[PDB]
């Protein structure tokens, strides 16, 4: 007979001891551990809710991979590249480039906790997290690999994180900040609680459903399978927060949650916002991006924060406001500078689409519609020179995304600037500036892509110079309009 897990599982994490040949601080240095001076004895109270054991892990994960690869093999003849809506193919290119090597980087945030967390349960769950993120990085390289032969843009599934392309810098500056560049307890709070529990879990669920709607069952099944892994390691941040809150560090816990949610939001708005409201074909639109945020993201944050004895972030009103506005401008930025993206943005402004945008965001036509009016007129009169940029956008020194506002009738745009140690920094929100000021040594000498351009690092100091700096290797790699301006026919 076998003895049930509950009977012996406690021994798996009975692994704290009192060091005596080195000190506790040498073994768990605050810069890598982030224990905030709380002693080893106290971290033994760490109470993660969900259990995983090594024999169970290897068996279930073997089965999950068998299924995912069998589906891929079975659907090889689906002709997804050829038959999909361009909006879907661009969804895939953007997804794989922003995500695949980022999942691999998450192995490192997990490893940071595996070695440096004072909580024994955290150390074991993070080992499984290391494994899970390895799976995800490998899956999301192996799957798009078939597409390299079809389209050079799929090379960016591997290449994006090895590039200085602006959106890649945005993703790396975010991930390097919350995953690979901080102590163990920060990673627990910023990655597992704030990003994975707060965003990616629900995002992947939505993405898998969109994939199925798009008729791509290999991808739908891939993303579903990956999402099933999430709770196993995403669970780690809540208990760390509870323990900090119990041990006199509520203010520090709240600050780290506040920063990580904001940072996650800005990247989410540029990468996923536009996909949902502009790329996904109209008739296949389940809901809008704001509806997604309201159904899947906002209330969930509110309730889990309440559950921990934490509060809504100081900026909550701003966040809710941003949901109405930000991604519409980020989309316009991505589309107008499309030649700088490794995917082909869909404009998403047929009259039919504009009606949808109006009912989802009342006043859309009087704001973003004004800009899209000018753009559409230029396309219809074959003034294509006026539909491509001849300068660079100004970029936030935190998010690494262009500084945007509300255009048209309600024109409002604000840059939050800061002089610090003799340099002028510009931010895209009050919150981005605040995040900088919470931890200046993390950020202060970083140069954004425009800082680099002005400093002489990008040669020649021109559009074409920038594109070569950003790592484009051929004409075909640079983003174009997804539908080759066919939308203008409906105008």
């Amino acid at each position: 007979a076998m003895h049930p897990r509950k009977d012996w599982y406690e021994l798996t994490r009975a692994t704290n001891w009192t060091p005596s040949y080195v000190t506790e601080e040498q073994l768990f240095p605050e810069r890598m551990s982030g224990h905030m001076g709380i002693p080893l004895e106290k971290w033994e109270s760490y109470d993660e809710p969900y259990k995983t054991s090594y024999p169970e892990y290897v068996s279930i994960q073997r089965e999950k991979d068998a299924g995912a690869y069998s589906v891929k093999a079975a659907l090889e003849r689906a002709k997804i590249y050829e038959n999909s809506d361009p909006g879907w193919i661009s969804t895939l290119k953007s997804h794989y480039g922003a995500i695949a090597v980022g999942e691999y980087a998450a192995v490192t945030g997990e490893g940071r906790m595996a070695r440096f967390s004072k909580a024994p349960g955290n150390r074991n769950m993070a080992t499984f997290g290391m494994m899970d993120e390895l799976r995800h990085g490998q899956l999301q390289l192996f799957f798009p690999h078939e597409y390299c032969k079809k389209d050079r843009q799929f090379d960016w599934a591997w290449r994006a994180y090895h590039s200085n392309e602006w959106a890649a810098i945005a993703a790396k500056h975010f991930f390097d900040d919350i995953i690979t560049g901080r102590d163990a307890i920060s990673v627990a709070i910023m990655l597992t609680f704030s990003f994975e529990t707060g965003f990616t879990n629900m995002q992947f669920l939505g993405l898998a459903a969109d994939a199925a709607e798009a008729g791509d069952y290999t991808f739908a099944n891939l993303i579903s399978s990956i999402q099933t892994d999430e709770s196993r390691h995403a669970q780690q941040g809540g208990p760390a927060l509870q323990l900090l809150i119990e041990n006199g560090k509520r203010e520090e816990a709240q600050k780290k949650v506040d920063m990580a949610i904001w940072r996650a939001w800005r990247l989410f708005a540029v990468l996923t916002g536009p996909v949902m409201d502009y790329y996904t074909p109209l008739e296949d639109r389940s809901q809008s991006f704001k509806e997604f945020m309201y159904e899947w993201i906002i209330g969930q944050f509110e309730r889990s924060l309440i559950d921990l004895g934490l509060d809504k972030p100081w900026y909550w009103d701003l966040f809710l406001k941003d949901i109405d506005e930000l991604h519409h401008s980020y989309h316009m930025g991505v589309w107008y500078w499309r030649t700088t993206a490794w995917w082909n943005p869909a404009a998403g402004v047929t009259p039919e689409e504009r009606d949808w945008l109006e009912e989802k965001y009342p006043g859309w036509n009087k704001r973003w519609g004004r800009c899209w009016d000018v753009i559409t007129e230029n396309v219809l009169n074959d003034r294509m020179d006026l539909v491509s940029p001849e300068t660079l956008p100004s970029v936030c020194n935190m998010s690494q995304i262009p500084l945007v506002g509300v255009p048209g009738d309600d024109w409002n745009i604000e840059v939050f600037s800061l002089e610090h140690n003799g340099r002028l920094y510009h931010f895209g929100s009050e919150v981005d500036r605040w995040v900088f000021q919470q931890d200046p040594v993390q950020y202060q000498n970083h140069m954004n892509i425009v800082d680099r351009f002005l400093a002489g690092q990008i040669q020649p100091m021109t559009l074409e110079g920038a594109l070569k700096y950003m790592g484009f290797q051929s004409i075909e790699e640079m983003g174009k309009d997804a539908h080759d301006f066919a939308w203008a026919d409906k105008c």
């Binding site: 290897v58 591997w158 390097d176 040594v441």
Partner: protein
């Protein structure tokens, strides 16, 4: 910009390979953090973690112009590792099941449960130290193919911890007055036979240079564990009519030999730079006496 045709594989592999292996597709050249020497991470160059990586990875006295070219001799990916380990672990779970049905633990020789309580169950601490240490080599190593070997080694370390946890509990059921599952922390911290091992691991876990961490963990500590812990434990089990423990250990030994094999492949790769021979030698010379003292104090406790 010119027109170029689609490549059959990733741009970094396309010159050399028409159809690279699954291993190469999913494993090769993933540490973007080695691209910018003065800014590993996309942050201020002097951010704390940037300073950590510049000191402990980039500046290691163990040097190679092409770490990214290291290849796991077994070429394991997540998928193939779980194929392999679900096999091995299902075998071990069947061993536990069947030996439990046979009432194995009741058949062991007088006193063996006390030897197990003192010399076997506290290995959960040692194995957890290997787990933590393999995690550290993972996060610091200067190539994704090296880090991947460490990932899988970290998991194997937890595998062994979990066996030890399961068998400590199971054994305590037959022998409830032996302290099994209640005294391991005390033994690890205070029993002289464990102090060599504990000092060794405390010191190893605070060697932060990636090269020193690799060489001390994988070239010194881990082979000492094979020869001075796992093998003598098998011998003792034999002498005490414990036939489960040697079969369990043979499974764990397959894991240890795999770790040995990749480690030896990394040394072969490192030795392409002739300056590395003396560096690796010097770390071995440094760590060996501590490991030999650990082994010696353990072996005599095991037999006492």
């Amino acid at each position: 910009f010119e027109s170029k045709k689609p490549m059959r594989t990733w741009s970094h592999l396309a010159e050399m390979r028409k159809k690279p292996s699954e291993y190469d597709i999913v494993s090769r050249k993933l540490h973007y953090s080695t691209n910018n020497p003065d800014s590993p991470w996309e942050l201020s160059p002097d951010s704390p973690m940037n300073l950590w990586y510049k000191q402990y990875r980039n500046a290691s006295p163990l040097k190679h112009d092409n770490w990214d070219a290291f290849t796991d001799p077994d070429q394991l990916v997540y998928r193939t590792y779980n194929l392999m380990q679900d096999g091995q672990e299902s075998y071990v779970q069947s061993l536990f099941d069947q030996f439990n049905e046979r009432e194995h633990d009741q058949m062991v020789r007088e006193g063996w449960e006390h030897t197990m309580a003192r010399c076997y169950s506290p290995l959960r601490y040692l194995f957890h130290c290997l787990q933590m240490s393999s995690a550290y080599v993972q996060q610091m190593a200067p190539a994704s193919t090296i880090s991947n070997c460490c990932i899988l080694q970290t998991a194997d370390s937890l595998r062994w911890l979990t066996h030890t946890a399961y068998r400590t509990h199971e054994l305590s059921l037959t022998y409830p007055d032996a302290g099994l599952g209640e005294h391991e922390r005390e033994l690890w911290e205070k029993e002289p036979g464990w102090q060599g091992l504990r000092e060794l691991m405390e010191k190893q876990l605070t060697a932060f240079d990636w090269g020193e961490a690799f060489v001390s963990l994988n070239l010194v500590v881990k082979p000492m564990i094979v020869e001075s812990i796992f093998k003598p434990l098998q011998q003792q089990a034999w002498e005490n009519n414990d036939t489960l423990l040697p079969l369990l250990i043979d499974s764990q030994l397959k894991d240890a030999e795999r770790h040995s094999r990749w480690s030896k492949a990394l040394v072969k790769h490192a030795l392409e730079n002739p300056d590395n021979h003396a560096v690796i030698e010097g770390w071995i010379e440094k760590w060996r006496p501590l490991a030999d003292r650990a082994a010696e104090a353990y072996l005599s406790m095991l037999s006492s």
